[PDB]
Amino acid sequence: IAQGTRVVFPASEREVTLRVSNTSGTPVLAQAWIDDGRQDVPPEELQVPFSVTPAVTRVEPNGGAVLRIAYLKAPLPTDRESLFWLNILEVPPRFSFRSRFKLFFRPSQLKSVDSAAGKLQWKFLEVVQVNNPTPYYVSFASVELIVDGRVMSVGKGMVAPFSTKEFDWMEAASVRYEVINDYGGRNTHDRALG
Protein backbone atom coordinates (compact mmCIF):
# COMPACT_ATOMS: atom_id res chain seq x y z
CA ILE A 1 0.00 0.00 0.00
CA ALA A 2 1.83 3.14 -1.37
CA GLN A 3 5.30 3.40 -2.98
CA GLY A 4 5.95 5.96 -1.50
CA THR A 5 7.73 6.18 1.76
CA ARG A 6 7.65 10.02 1.79
CA VAL A 7 6.19 12.90 -0.28
CA VAL A 8 8.32 15.85 -1.42
CA PHE A 9 6.29 18.86 -2.22
CA PRO A 10 8.26 21.43 -4.22
CA ALA A 11 7.04 25.06 -3.74
CA SER A 12 6.94 25.64 -7.53
CA GLU A 13 4.15 22.97 -7.92
CA ARG A 14 0.41 23.44 -7.49
CA GLU A 15 -0.10 19.70 -6.96
CA VAL A 16 1.79 16.34 -6.75
CA THR A 17 0.34 12.84 -7.27
CA LEU A 18 0.98 9.58 -5.41
CA ARG A 19 0.00 5.96 -6.14
CA VAL A 20 -1.63 3.68 -3.60
CA SER A 21 -1.80 -0.02 -4.56
CA ASN A 22 -4.23 -2.65 -3.34
CA THR A 23 -2.13 -5.79 -3.29
CA SER A 24 -4.96 -8.08 -2.07
CA GLY A 25 -7.80 -9.82 -3.96
CA THR A 26 -10.71 -7.72 -2.54
CA PRO A 27 -11.63 -4.04 -3.15
CA VAL A 28 -10.79 -1.64 -0.29
CA LEU A 29 -11.67 1.93 0.52
CA ALA A 30 -8.73 4.21 1.02
CA GLN A 31 -9.17 7.40 3.07
CA ALA A 32 -6.42 9.98 2.80
CA TRP A 33 -5.87 13.26 4.73
CA ILE A 34 -3.03 15.52 5.84
CA ASP A 35 -2.16 16.73 9.28
CA ASP A 36 0.62 18.96 10.71
CA GLY A 37 1.71 16.48 13.43
CA ARG A 38 -1.35 16.62 15.72
CA GLN A 39 -3.17 13.24 15.34
CA ASP A 40 -5.40 13.76 18.26
CA VAL A 41 -7.89 16.23 16.73
CA PRO A 42 -10.29 16.31 13.76
CA PRO A 43 -8.01 17.13 10.81
CA GLU A 44 -10.27 19.90 9.38
CA GLU A 45 -9.68 22.12 12.40
CA LEU A 46 -5.90 22.28 11.77
CA GLN A 47 -6.49 24.15 8.47
CA VAL A 48 -3.34 22.70 6.90
CA PRO A 49 -2.72 24.20 3.44
CA PHE A 50 -3.06 20.86 1.67
CA SER A 51 -6.03 18.96 0.29
CA VAL A 52 -6.09 15.32 -0.90
CA THR A 53 -8.37 14.44 -3.76
CA PRO A 54 -10.19 12.20 -3.64
CA ALA A 55 -10.42 11.95 0.19
CA VAL A 56 -11.90 8.44 0.01
CA THR A 57 -11.21 6.02 -2.83
CA ARG A 58 -11.99 2.49 -3.93
CA VAL A 59 -8.90 0.57 -4.95
CA GLU A 60 -9.40 -2.45 -7.20
CA PRO A 61 -8.06 -5.88 -6.37
CA ASN A 62 -4.46 -6.00 -7.70
CA GLY A 63 -4.86 -2.43 -8.80
CA GLY A 64 -3.99 1.06 -7.74
CA ALA A 65 -5.49 4.46 -7.26
CA VAL A 66 -3.95 7.85 -7.69
CA LEU A 67 -4.23 10.47 -4.97
CA ARG A 68 -3.73 14.09 -5.75
CA ILE A 69 -2.12 16.50 -3.27
CA ALA A 70 -2.77 20.29 -3.87
CA TYR A 71 -1.13 23.22 -2.07
CA LEU A 72 -3.20 26.29 -1.14
CA LYS A 73 -0.69 29.19 -1.27
CA ALA A 74 -0.33 29.90 2.46
CA PRO A 75 2.43 31.52 4.66
CA LEU A 76 5.05 28.80 5.39
CA PRO A 77 8.71 29.39 6.19
CA THR A 78 10.66 30.44 3.07
CA ASP A 79 14.16 29.47 4.38
CA ARG A 80 13.53 25.86 5.46
CA GLU A 81 11.48 22.77 4.70
CA SER A 82 8.12 22.33 6.43
CA LEU A 83 6.96 18.96 7.73
CA PHE A 84 3.41 17.56 7.26
CA TRP A 85 2.03 14.04 7.47
CA LEU A 86 0.00 12.11 4.94
CA ASN A 87 -2.29 9.53 6.51
CA ILE A 88 -3.81 6.61 4.53
CA LEU A 89 -6.45 4.50 6.19
CA GLU A 90 -7.66 1.23 4.71
CA VAL A 91 -11.26 0.49 5.61
CA PRO A 92 -11.15 -2.76 3.78
CA PRO A 93 -14.09 -5.00 4.68
CA ARG A 94 -16.23 -5.47 6.64
CA PHE A 95 -10.45 -4.59 11.40
CA SER A 96 -8.78 -1.60 9.45
CA PHE A 97 -5.10 -0.48 8.95
CA ARG A 98 -3.53 3.04 9.05
CA SER A 99 -0.38 4.41 7.38
CA ARG A 100 1.52 7.61 8.06
CA PHE A 101 4.05 9.29 5.57
CA LYS A 102 6.24 12.37 5.91
CA LEU A 103 5.38 15.27 3.64
CA PHE A 104 8.20 17.76 3.06
CA PHE A 105 7.20 21.17 1.73
CA ARG A 106 10.36 22.45 0.10
CA PRO A 107 10.90 26.10 -0.93
CA SER A 108 12.40 26.44 -4.46
CA GLN A 109 15.69 27.96 -3.47
CA LEU A 110 16.53 24.76 -1.44
CA LYS A 111 18.58 22.76 -3.95
CA SER A 112 21.11 21.07 -1.70
CA VAL A 113 19.14 18.47 0.22
CA ASP A 114 21.59 15.84 -1.11
CA SER A 115 24.42 17.52 0.84
CA ALA A 116 22.64 17.90 4.12
CA ALA A 117 23.34 14.64 5.99
CA GLY A 118 27.04 15.33 5.49
CA LYS A 119 27.03 18.72 7.31
CA LEU A 120 25.68 17.31 10.54
CA GLN A 121 28.15 17.69 13.36
CA TRP A 122 28.35 15.26 16.19
CA LYS A 123 29.37 15.33 19.83
CA PHE A 124 29.27 13.56 23.18
CA LEU A 125 27.21 14.83 26.12
CA GLU A 126 27.97 11.61 28.04
CA VAL A 127 24.61 10.50 25.35
CA VAL A 128 25.42 11.95 21.90
CA GLN A 129 24.10 14.86 19.94
CA VAL A 130 23.79 15.77 16.29
CA ASN A 131 23.50 19.39 15.17
CA ASN A 132 21.64 20.04 11.94
CA PRO A 133 22.83 23.44 10.76
CA THR A 134 20.93 23.04 7.43
CA PRO A 135 17.44 23.95 6.09
CA TYR A 136 16.40 20.28 5.56
CA TYR A 137 14.98 17.52 7.65
CA VAL A 138 17.41 14.66 7.82
CA SER A 139 15.86 11.26 8.47
CA PHE A 140 18.02 8.51 9.93
CA ALA A 141 17.29 4.82 9.28
CA SER A 142 20.04 4.00 11.77
CA VAL A 143 22.67 5.66 13.89
CA GLU A 144 25.53 3.73 15.40
CA LEU A 145 28.56 4.29 17.59
CA ILE A 146 31.63 2.32 16.43
CA VAL A 147 34.85 1.57 18.32
CA ASP A 148 37.41 -0.81 16.78
CA GLY A 149 34.63 -2.51 14.74
CA ARG A 150 32.19 -2.82 17.71
CA VAL A 151 28.81 -1.48 16.82
CA MET A 152 26.52 0.09 19.39
CA SER A 153 23.19 1.02 17.97
CA VAL A 154 21.67 4.28 19.27
CA GLY A 155 18.41 4.44 17.33
CA LYS A 156 16.80 6.05 14.32
CA GLY A 157 14.87 9.29 14.02
CA MET A 158 14.84 12.63 12.34
CA VAL A 159 16.47 15.93 13.01
CA ALA A 160 14.64 19.09 11.96
CA PRO A 161 16.32 22.00 10.14
CA PHE A 162 18.42 24.26 12.39
CA SER A 163 17.92 21.84 15.35
CA THR A 164 19.69 19.32 17.53
CA LYS A 165 18.80 15.72 18.27
CA GLU A 166 20.09 13.63 21.19
CA PHE A 167 20.73 9.89 21.00
CA ASP A 168 21.50 7.84 24.05
CA TRP A 169 23.41 4.66 24.73
CA MET A 170 33.72 5.66 25.61
CA GLU A 171 35.71 6.72 23.73
CA ALA A 172 37.65 6.64 20.44
CA ALA A 173 34.11 6.50 18.94
CA SER A 174 33.14 7.35 15.41
CA VAL A 175 29.50 7.75 14.41
CA ARG A 176 28.00 5.84 11.41
CA TYR A 177 24.66 6.85 10.13
CA GLU A 178 22.28 6.13 7.27
CA VAL A 179 19.85 8.60 5.94
CA ILE A 180 16.73 8.26 3.79
CA ASN A 181 16.76 10.32 0.60
CA ASP A 182 13.73 11.85 -1.24
CA TYR A 183 13.07 8.50 -3.03
CA GLY A 184 13.33 6.15 -0.05
CA GLY A 185 16.93 5.13 -0.84
CA ARG A 186 19.66 5.26 1.75
CA ASN A 187 23.09 6.81 1.93
CA THR A 188 25.69 6.33 4.67
CA HIS A 189 28.24 8.54 6.45
CA ASP A 190 30.97 8.15 9.05
CA ARG A 191 32.04 11.06 11.30
CA ALA A 192 34.18 11.60 14.40
CA LEU A 193 32.54 12.77 17.67
CA GLY A 194 33.43 16.19 19.07
mmCIF file of C-alpha atoms in Angstrom:
data_model
loop_
_atom_site.group_PDB
_atom_site.id
_atom_site.type_symbol
_atom_site.label_atom_id
_atom_site.label_comp_id
_atom_site.label_asym_id
_atom_site.label_seq_id
_atom_site.Cartn_x
_atom_site.Cartn_y
_atom_site.Cartn_z
ATOM 1 C CA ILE A 1 0.000 0.000 0.000
ATOM 2 C CA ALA A 2 1.832 3.144 -1.374
ATOM 3 C CA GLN A 3 5.301 3.404 -2.980
ATOM 4 C CA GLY A 4 5.946 5.959 -1.495
ATOM 5 C CA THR A 5 7.732 6.184 1.758
ATOM 6 C CA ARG A 6 7.652 10.020 1.786
ATOM 7 C CA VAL A 7 6.193 12.897 -0.276
ATOM 8 C CA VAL A 8 8.319 15.853 -1.416
ATOM 9 C CA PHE A 9 6.287 18.859 -2.220
ATOM 10 C CA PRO A 10 8.260 21.434 -4.215
ATOM 11 C CA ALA A 11 7.039 25.055 -3.744
ATOM 12 C CA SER A 12 6.942 25.642 -7.527
ATOM 13 C CA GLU A 13 4.155 22.971 -7.918
ATOM 14 C CA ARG A 14 0.412 23.442 -7.494
ATOM 15 C CA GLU A 15 -0.102 19.695 -6.961
ATOM 16 C CA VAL A 16 1.793 16.337 -6.752
ATOM 17 C CA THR A 17 0.340 12.845 -7.272
ATOM 18 C CA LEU A 18 0.977 9.583 -5.407
ATOM 19 C CA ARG A 19 -0.003 5.964 -6.142
ATOM 20 C CA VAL A 20 -1.627 3.675 -3.600
ATOM 21 C CA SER A 21 -1.798 -0.020 -4.560
ATOM 22 C CA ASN A 22 -4.226 -2.647 -3.336
ATOM 23 C CA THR A 23 -2.131 -5.790 -3.286
ATOM 24 C CA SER A 24 -4.956 -8.084 -2.070
ATOM 25 C CA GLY A 25 -7.805 -9.823 -3.958
ATOM 26 C CA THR A 26 -10.713 -7.718 -2.540
ATOM 27 C CA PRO A 27 -11.635 -4.042 -3.153
ATOM 28 C CA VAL A 28 -10.787 -1.644 -0.287
ATOM 29 C CA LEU A 29 -11.671 1.933 0.523
ATOM 30 C CA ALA A 30 -8.734 4.214 1.023
ATOM 31 C CA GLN A 31 -9.165 7.404 3.070
ATOM 32 C CA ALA A 32 -6.417 9.982 2.805
ATOM 33 C CA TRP A 33 -5.866 13.262 4.726
ATOM 34 C CA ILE A 34 -3.026 15.515 5.836
ATOM 35 C CA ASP A 35 -2.165 16.733 9.282
ATOM 36 C CA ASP A 36 0.622 18.959 10.713
ATOM 37 C CA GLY A 37 1.711 16.478 13.429
ATOM 38 C CA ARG A 38 -1.351 16.621 15.716
ATOM 39 C CA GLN A 39 -3.171 13.237 15.343
ATOM 40 C CA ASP A 40 -5.402 13.759 18.262
ATOM 41 C CA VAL A 41 -7.891 16.233 16.726
ATOM 42 C CA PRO A 42 -10.286 16.308 13.764
ATOM 43 C CA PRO A 43 -8.012 17.131 10.812
ATOM 44 C CA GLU A 44 -10.275 19.897 9.377
ATOM 45 C CA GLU A 45 -9.678 22.115 12.398
ATOM 46 C CA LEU A 46 -5.902 22.284 11.771
ATOM 47 C CA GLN A 47 -6.492 24.152 8.472
ATOM 48 C CA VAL A 48 -3.343 22.702 6.896
ATOM 49 C CA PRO A 49 -2.719 24.201 3.439
ATOM 50 C CA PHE A 50 -3.057 20.860 1.665
ATOM 51 C CA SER A 51 -6.033 18.955 0.292
ATOM 52 C CA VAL A 52 -6.086 15.319 -0.897
ATOM 53 C CA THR A 53 -8.370 14.441 -3.765
ATOM 54 C CA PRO A 54 -10.192 12.199 -3.636
ATOM 55 C CA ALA A 55 -10.422 11.951 0.189
ATOM 56 C CA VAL A 56 -11.899 8.439 0.005
ATOM 57 C CA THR A 57 -11.207 6.025 -2.826
ATOM 58 C CA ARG A 58 -11.994 2.492 -3.933
ATOM 59 C CA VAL A 59 -8.896 0.574 -4.954
ATOM 60 C CA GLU A 60 -9.405 -2.446 -7.204
ATOM 61 C CA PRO A 61 -8.063 -5.884 -6.367
ATOM 62 C CA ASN A 62 -4.458 -5.995 -7.697
ATOM 63 C CA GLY A 63 -4.860 -2.431 -8.802
ATOM 64 C CA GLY A 64 -3.990 1.056 -7.737
ATOM 65 C CA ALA A 65 -5.489 4.462 -7.258
ATOM 66 C CA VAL A 66 -3.954 7.852 -7.691
ATOM 67 C CA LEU A 67 -4.231 10.474 -4.974
ATOM 68 C CA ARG A 68 -3.730 14.090 -5.752
ATOM 69 C CA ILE A 69 -2.122 16.504 -3.266
ATOM 70 C CA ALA A 70 -2.772 20.288 -3.868
ATOM 71 C CA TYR A 71 -1.132 23.223 -2.069
ATOM 72 C CA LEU A 72 -3.197 26.290 -1.143
ATOM 73 C CA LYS A 73 -0.689 29.190 -1.268
ATOM 74 C CA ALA A 74 -0.329 29.900 2.465
ATOM 75 C CA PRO A 75 2.428 31.516 4.662
ATOM 76 C CA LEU A 76 5.046 28.799 5.385
ATOM 77 C CA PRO A 77 8.709 29.386 6.186
ATOM 78 C CA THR A 78 10.658 30.439 3.068
ATOM 79 C CA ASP A 79 14.156 29.471 4.377
ATOM 80 C CA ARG A 80 13.532 25.856 5.458
ATOM 81 C CA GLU A 81 11.479 22.773 4.702
ATOM 82 C CA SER A 82 8.120 22.328 6.427
ATOM 83 C CA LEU A 83 6.956 18.960 7.727
ATOM 84 C CA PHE A 84 3.414 17.556 7.259
ATOM 85 C CA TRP A 85 2.025 14.037 7.473
ATOM 86 C CA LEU A 86 0.005 12.107 4.940
ATOM 87 C CA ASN A 87 -2.291 9.533 6.509
ATOM 88 C CA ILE A 88 -3.810 6.608 4.529
ATOM 89 C CA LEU A 89 -6.452 4.505 6.187
ATOM 90 C CA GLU A 90 -7.665 1.226 4.709
ATOM 91 C CA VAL A 91 -11.261 0.494 5.610
ATOM 92 C CA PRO A 92 -11.151 -2.762 3.777
ATOM 93 C CA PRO A 93 -14.090 -4.999 4.680
ATOM 94 C CA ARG A 94 -16.234 -5.467 6.635
ATOM 95 C CA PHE A 95 -10.448 -4.586 11.402
ATOM 96 C CA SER A 96 -8.780 -1.603 9.454
ATOM 97 C CA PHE A 97 -5.103 -0.480 8.947
ATOM 98 C CA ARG A 98 -3.528 3.038 9.047
ATOM 99 C CA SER A 99 -0.379 4.406 7.381
ATOM 100 C CA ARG A 100 1.525 7.609 8.062
ATOM 101 C CA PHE A 101 4.049 9.295 5.571
ATOM 102 C CA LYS A 102 6.244 12.370 5.911
ATOM 103 C CA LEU A 103 5.375 15.269 3.638
ATOM 104 C CA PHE A 104 8.202 17.761 3.058
ATOM 105 C CA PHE A 105 7.201 21.168 1.727
ATOM 106 C CA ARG A 106 10.357 22.445 0.101
ATOM 107 C CA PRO A 107 10.897 26.098 -0.931
ATOM 108 C CA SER A 108 12.401 26.438 -4.461
ATOM 109 C CA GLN A 109 15.687 27.958 -3.467
ATOM 110 C CA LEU A 110 16.530 24.764 -1.438
ATOM 111 C CA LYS A 111 18.577 22.763 -3.951
ATOM 112 C CA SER A 112 21.111 21.071 -1.698
ATOM 113 C CA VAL A 113 19.140 18.472 0.221
ATOM 114 C CA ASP A 114 21.586 15.842 -1.114
ATOM 115 C CA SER A 115 24.415 17.524 0.835
ATOM 116 C CA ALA A 116 22.640 17.904 4.120
ATOM 117 C CA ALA A 117 23.337 14.635 5.987
ATOM 118 C CA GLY A 118 27.037 15.333 5.486
ATOM 119 C CA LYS A 119 27.027 18.722 7.314
ATOM 120 C CA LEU A 120 25.676 17.306 10.542
ATOM 121 C CA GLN A 121 28.150 17.690 13.355
ATOM 122 C CA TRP A 122 28.353 15.256 16.192
ATOM 123 C CA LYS A 123 29.373 15.335 19.830
ATOM 124 C CA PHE A 124 29.268 13.562 23.183
ATOM 125 C CA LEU A 125 27.215 14.832 26.119
ATOM 126 C CA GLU A 126 27.975 11.610 28.037
ATOM 127 C CA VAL A 127 24.614 10.497 25.347
ATOM 128 C CA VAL A 128 25.421 11.953 21.903
ATOM 129 C CA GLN A 129 24.105 14.858 19.938
ATOM 130 C CA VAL A 130 23.794 15.773 16.291
ATOM 131 C CA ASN A 131 23.501 19.387 15.169
ATOM 132 C CA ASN A 132 21.643 20.036 11.942
ATOM 133 C CA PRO A 133 22.826 23.438 10.763
ATOM 134 C CA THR A 134 20.932 23.036 7.429
ATOM 135 C CA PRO A 135 17.438 23.949 6.094
ATOM 136 C CA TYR A 136 16.403 20.280 5.556
ATOM 137 C CA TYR A 137 14.980 17.522 7.655
ATOM 138 C CA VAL A 138 17.414 14.657 7.824
ATOM 139 C CA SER A 139 15.859 11.264 8.475
ATOM 140 C CA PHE A 140 18.018 8.508 9.934
ATOM 141 C CA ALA A 141 17.290 4.821 9.282
ATOM 142 C CA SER A 142 20.042 3.999 11.770
ATOM 143 C CA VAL A 143 22.667 5.663 13.887
ATOM 144 C CA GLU A 144 25.529 3.725 15.400
ATOM 145 C CA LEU A 145 28.556 4.293 17.591
ATOM 146 C CA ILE A 146 31.632 2.324 16.427
ATOM 147 C CA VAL A 147 34.853 1.574 18.320
ATOM 148 C CA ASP A 148 37.414 -0.812 16.782
ATOM 149 C CA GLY A 149 34.629 -2.507 14.742
ATOM 150 C CA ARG A 150 32.193 -2.824 17.714
ATOM 151 C CA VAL A 151 28.808 -1.477 16.820
ATOM 152 C CA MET A 152 26.518 0.087 19.393
ATOM 153 C CA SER A 153 23.191 1.024 17.972
ATOM 154 C CA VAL A 154 21.667 4.277 19.271
ATOM 155 C CA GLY A 155 18.412 4.436 17.330
ATOM 156 C CA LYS A 156 16.800 6.052 14.324
ATOM 157 C CA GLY A 157 14.873 9.287 14.022
ATOM 158 C CA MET A 158 14.839 12.629 12.343
ATOM 159 C CA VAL A 159 16.469 15.925 13.012
ATOM 160 C CA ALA A 160 14.637 19.092 11.962
ATOM 161 C CA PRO A 161 16.321 22.004 10.136
ATOM 162 C CA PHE A 162 18.418 24.264 12.394
ATOM 163 C CA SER A 163 17.918 21.839 15.351
ATOM 164 C CA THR A 164 19.691 19.318 17.532
ATOM 165 C CA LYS A 165 18.796 15.717 18.272
ATOM 166 C CA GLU A 166 20.091 13.627 21.191
ATOM 167 C CA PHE A 167 20.727 9.894 21.000
ATOM 168 C CA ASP A 168 21.497 7.838 24.054
ATOM 169 C CA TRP A 169 23.413 4.655 24.730
ATOM 170 C CA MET A 170 33.718 5.661 25.610
ATOM 171 C CA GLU A 171 35.709 6.719 23.729
ATOM 172 C CA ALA A 172 37.647 6.643 20.437
ATOM 173 C CA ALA A 173 34.114 6.503 18.939
ATOM 174 C CA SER A 174 33.136 7.347 15.407
ATOM 175 C CA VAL A 175 29.502 7.752 14.407
ATOM 176 C CA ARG A 176 28.003 5.837 11.408
ATOM 177 C CA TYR A 177 24.662 6.852 10.127
ATOM 178 C CA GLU A 178 22.280 6.127 7.271
ATOM 179 C CA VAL A 179 19.849 8.599 5.941
ATOM 180 C CA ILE A 180 16.730 8.262 3.794
ATOM 181 C CA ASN A 181 16.764 10.320 0.605
ATOM 182 C CA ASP A 182 13.732 11.849 -1.244
ATOM 183 C CA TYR A 183 13.072 8.504 -3.034
ATOM 184 C CA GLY A 184 13.326 6.152 -0.055
ATOM 185 C CA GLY A 185 16.928 5.129 -0.843
ATOM 186 C CA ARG A 186 19.659 5.264 1.754
ATOM 187 C CA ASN A 187 23.089 6.812 1.927
ATOM 188 C CA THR A 188 25.695 6.332 4.670
ATOM 189 C CA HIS A 189 28.236 8.541 6.445
ATOM 190 C CA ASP A 190 30.965 8.153 9.047
ATOM 191 C CA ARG A 191 32.036 11.059 11.303
ATOM 192 C CA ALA A 192 34.178 11.599 14.399
ATOM 193 C CA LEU A 193 32.540 12.768 17.674
ATOM 194 C CA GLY A 194 33.430 16.193 19.072
#
